[PDB]
């Protein structure tokens, strides 16, 4: 279950109980489509069915012509494996590898082993069910069903070409055109990873797609091969907690904790994700990626329970920005109401049930459903869980608004204290 | 080729050898689709083929009804040309110009000359191959092929309508539906520009789409005309270099160069792009746009070779943020490792090959393939090139951590030096 606590000492909420799934590695698979080489239709006539076939084959030719025209780095592995594929004598190895069945494990020149799927079989249909069936003497097809089937088998290449032209070679997330669900699940169940990671990643294909990349690789020698870059979750089932902060001001000077975001346990340290877009929450997991993360010693947990600890000084922002605002955390809401603005929390049926005063306050989602600040209306999350409210005395009251350095952006607690001491010693 | 250098004096990397392609101008073309006006089907019957035809024509009517419901500015030129089109007596000129062929050059009321292409000919099919073929006496069509052909010719308008409804009138990038590759290439080969810019922009249609805008213009008088806003590259083939910076700290105070991004030569000055998403790199070119750029004197190059130059002071950020991090530049990687965090560089087959010490260090992509910082795993680019490592002494060591102004965000070298001098004079 998910449990939330609210420290009034620093006006900050912590939501714990989450589990982890960290994108730590990249795996590169090579998806190959077997195309066919055709010059032109020998026969010509006024039949409309052959006109439809000619139009469809011309669209296929245009599609195959289009594909011949194509901090950290998120696509470095795919670029490396594409450079490997461009090496001579490598495409033929793949093409001769998965000839009897559409699943192979191949070793390239660089020594890296990759999985190969033959996801489409367009060559067989074009060269064995269109050219021989089409009788060039009469230039007519008896059944329109053949044309309808061609339109039902050539769509996938057209959609792949369209997506690659729109996104300019690299696309994300991988769509159902580029990788069907059955194939994605099969590749997941055959990827070189533990059975623990294969049971968390089969049930969450909704997010594997969002965190995957796909890069156009090769069209040469009647084989359209592109690299799909799946993630490998190297950290699974470790506790994580989200930290939300709100402005805290006197009734002025404002001190806001400036380390909002996700924290996850990782090999004895804490992986810190400041960006909210980085992480995603399905039920109680965080599907974050370490590419947008920092590494911190395992004492940042002490910041949440003691703002004045001596082992790891926290980070704050000091400013005279006296503006009311609210943060809709999970299982509740934090409101900071100052000035003449009216702030309230309203139930769905009992209307206004609170008359928020000046300062920082917190309301659980048990009962409270909407929060009005000024006129802005926020809806609180309705996730079931237990909330705890620890009372205290706001930190900003301990300081004095006479030598307060209301100019910093984010230094630390210790830096603010030493600046205050220097200012006091100056007088 | 691409050449990288790493200055340890400021812990910054420069990647040179790139070429330029700057989006300097906008060109507006008018893409017109000739629709047809139809009231309703006179005949009615229980035949299923006529039901399919009625459904398709009703979808066409709904699509045509939908389109009647529709720092710097990136769409100012298109808005201006649309305002020109809304003027009376202008749509008829376009309609009567491209009457004999689907290519025209027209002069509007404002005097600006624009290219007009008729990309679709739906009116001819609807009014000359559907109404006369459909015999209203029997209300039946002999061949289902006519319906299948209608479904293969009406998809374009449906997709255009869908994209315009989703994106609310303005769309980017121009997808394959709204402008096919052959049409885009013909428009490129007939646009009013030099043959030099027509040979760089034909081979890079993958990026012209991404940097182009398309806006709905007019539906009045059975002509659906929308403006495609292509870019005009006014600066081509000038040297460009990318500048990457990493935190530099003592073993504390941290001084980071704060001018990351692209630099390009431009008419004797330097165009500076701070945003990384602004520029795109296909092989060795930068397809940037000047709308997100600054202009600097041609002495910012001296910042890279002499941090303490007297002609153009550089820009720095001073803070006590002692956090380890890495920057994956092209052809190598910069790693700044501080505190107790473990930082290493690992080969694919030889495993860990380095044991990075505290400070800033740099590893080329020759051999080094992965970089581990804490637990975050980064993959270095595998682009072939030459790396150079110039030794020196870190600039931060020259300062003293006693009067250091660890509060600024980005002032300059000169401002930091004068603040240090003022602090020294105060004592």
């Amino acid at each position, epitope marked *: 279950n998910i449990t939330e606590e609210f420290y009034q000492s620093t006006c900050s909420a912590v939501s714990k109980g989450y*589990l982890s799934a960290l994108r*730590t*590695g990249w795996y590169t698979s090579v998806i190959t489509i077997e195309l066919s080489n055709i010059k032109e239709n020998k026969c010509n006539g006024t039949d409309a069915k052959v006109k439809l076939i000619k139009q469809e084959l011309d669209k296929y030719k245009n599609a195959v012509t289009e594909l011949q025209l194509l901090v950290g780095s998120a696509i470095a592995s795919g670029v490396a494996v594409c450079k490997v594929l461009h090496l001579e004598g490598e495409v033929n190895k793949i093409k001769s590898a998965l000839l009897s069945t559409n699943k192979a*494990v191949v*070793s390239l020149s660089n*020594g*890296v*082993s990759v*999985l190969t799927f033959k996801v489409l079989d367009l060559k067989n249909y074009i060269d064995k069910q269109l050219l021989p069936i089409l009788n060039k003497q009469s230039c007519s097809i008896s059944n329109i069903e053949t044309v309808i089937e061609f339109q039902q088998k050539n769509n996938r290449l057209l959609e792949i070409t369209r997506e690659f032209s729109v996104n300019a070679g690299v696309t994300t997330p991988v769509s159902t055109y580029m990788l069907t669900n059955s194939e994605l699940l099969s590749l997941i169940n*055959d990827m*070189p*990873i*533990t*059975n*623990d*990671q294969k*049971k*968390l990643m089969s049930n969450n294909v909704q997010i594997v797609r969002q965190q995957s990349y796909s890069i156009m690789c090769i069209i040469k020698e009647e084989v359209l091969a592109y690299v799909v870059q799946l993630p*490998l979750y*190297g*950290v*699974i*089932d*470790t*506790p994580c907690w989200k930290l939300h902060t709100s402005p805290l001001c006197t009734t002025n000077i404002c001190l806001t904790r400036t380390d909002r975001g996700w924290y996850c*346990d*990782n*090999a*004895g340290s804490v992986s810190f994700f400041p960006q909210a877009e980085t992480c995603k929450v399905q039920s109680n997991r965080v599907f974050c990626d370490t590419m947008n993360s920092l590494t911190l010693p*395992s004492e940042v947990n002490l910041c949440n329970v003691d703002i004045f600890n001596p082992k790891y000084d926290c980070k704050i922002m000091t400013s005279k920005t006296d503006v009311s605002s609210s943060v809709i955390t999970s299982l509740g809401a934090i409101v900071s109401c100052y000035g003449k603005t009216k702030c309230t929390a309203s139930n769905k049926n009992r209307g206004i049930i609170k008359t928020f005063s000046n300062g920082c306050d917190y309301v659980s989602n048990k009962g409270v459903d909407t929060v009005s600040v000024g006129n802005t209306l926020y809806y609180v999350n309705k996730q079931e869980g237990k909330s705890l409210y620890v009372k205290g005395e706001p930190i900003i009251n301990f300081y004095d608004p006479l030598v307060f350095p209301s100019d910093e952006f984010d230094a630390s607690i210790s830096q603010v204290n030493e600046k205050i001491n220097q200012s006091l010693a100056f007088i | 080729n691409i050449t990288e250098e790493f200055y340890q004096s400021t812990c910054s990397a420069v990647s040179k050898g790139y070429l330029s392609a700057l989006r300097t101008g906008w060109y507006t073309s008018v893409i017109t689709i000739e629709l047809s006006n139809i009231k309703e089907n006179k005949c009615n019957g229980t035949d299923a083929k006529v039901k399919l035809i009625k459904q398709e024509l009703d979808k066409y009517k709904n699509a045509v009804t939908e389109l009647q419901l529709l720092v710097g500015s990136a769409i100012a030129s298109g808005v201006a040309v649309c305002k020109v089109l809304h003027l009376e007596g202008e749509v008829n000129k376009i309609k009567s110009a491209l009457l004999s062929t689907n290519k025209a050059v027209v002069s509007l009321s404002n005097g600006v000359s624009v290219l007009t292409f008729k990309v679709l000919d739906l009116k001819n099919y609807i009014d000359k191959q559907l109404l006369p073929i459909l015999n209203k006496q029997s209300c039946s069509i002999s061949n289902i092929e006519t319906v299948i052909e209608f479904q293969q010719k009406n998809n374009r308008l449906l997709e255009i309508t869908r994209e315009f409804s989703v994106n609310a009138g303005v769309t980017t990038p121009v997808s394959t539906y709204m402008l096919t590759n052959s049409e885009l290439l013909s428009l490129i080969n007939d646009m009013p520009i030099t043959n030099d810019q027509k040979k760089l922009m034909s081979n890079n249609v993958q990026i012209v789409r991404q940097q182009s805008y398309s806006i709905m213009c007019i539906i009045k008088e059975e002509v659906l005309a929308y403006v495609v806003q292509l870019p005009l590259y006014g600066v081509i083939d000038t040297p460009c270099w990318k500048l990457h910076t990493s935190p530099l700290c003592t073993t504390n105070i941290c001084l980071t160069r704060t001018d990351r991004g692209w630099y390009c030569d431009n008419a004797g000055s330097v165009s500076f792009f701070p945003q990384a998403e602004t520029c795109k790199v296909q092989s060795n070119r930068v397809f940037c746009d000047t709308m997100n750029s600054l202009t600097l004197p041609s002495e910012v190059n001296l910042c890279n070779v002499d941090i303490f130059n007297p002609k153009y002071d550089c820009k720095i950020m001073t803070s006590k943020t002692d956090v380890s991090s890495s920057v994956i530049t092209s052809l190598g990687a910069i790693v700044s490792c501080y505190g107790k965090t473990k930082c290493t560089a*690992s080969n694919k*087959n*030889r*495993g*860990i090959i380095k044991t990075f010490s505290n400070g800033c260090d740099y590893v080329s992509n020759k051999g080094v393939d*992965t970089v*581990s910082v804490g*637990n975050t*795993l980064y993959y270095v680019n595998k682009q072939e090139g030459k790396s150079l490592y110039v030794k020196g002494e870190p600039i931060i060591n020259f300062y003293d951590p006693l009067v250091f102004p660890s509060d600024e965000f980005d002032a300059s070298i000169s401002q930091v030096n004068e603040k240090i001098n003022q602090s020294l004079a105060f004592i």
Partner: T-cell receptor
Amino acid sequence: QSVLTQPPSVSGAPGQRVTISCTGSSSSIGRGYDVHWYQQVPGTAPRLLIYANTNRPSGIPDRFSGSKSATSASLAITGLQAEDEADYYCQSYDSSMLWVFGGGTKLTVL
Amino acid sequence: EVQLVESGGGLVKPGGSLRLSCAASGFSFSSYNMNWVRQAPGKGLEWVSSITGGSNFIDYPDSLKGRFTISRDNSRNSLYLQMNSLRAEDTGLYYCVRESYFGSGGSLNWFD
């Protein structure tokens, strides 16, 4: 009967390098899972020797080495001494058997 | 200072039930995985049971599936393995071994 195959015993003289092989199938070393080399001196709990198939934990002498290629892994000991006589186990994964472990190589000094 | 001390072993008649406990100290237990591995006297090693940090990814091999039940209690840093319906095998040493990541992604990490 183990998933992987290992020589029953290898021998050598002091100052001589010895190579121990770890061979497996497709759903094995193949597909590139990894191999890990564990040491066991009798009467003592097993100790990690080589992890990630090439690296080395701190506190292990540099004379040890490990590598892999195609479908076979190797562990090389350079400069054999009396303290290296032990049971050596090679480890990898299996899509149908999970953690496999080796059959045990008994290395002794002559 | 990673200490893994295991206890609870003793003589049991065939077909009996048994419990084995493992206490871990000196490291953050809640993030590292755990495993139980066998070693018959004079025979090779053989993996027996696995569990992850969140106690919701259980894993057994095919031969011992449905008999051995593993459960980690995170409150006092404890691991337990319950053995039902013993057979002639399973005799020997049982090791409570911490599965420790941070050797890159690398699937199988490095149980130290």
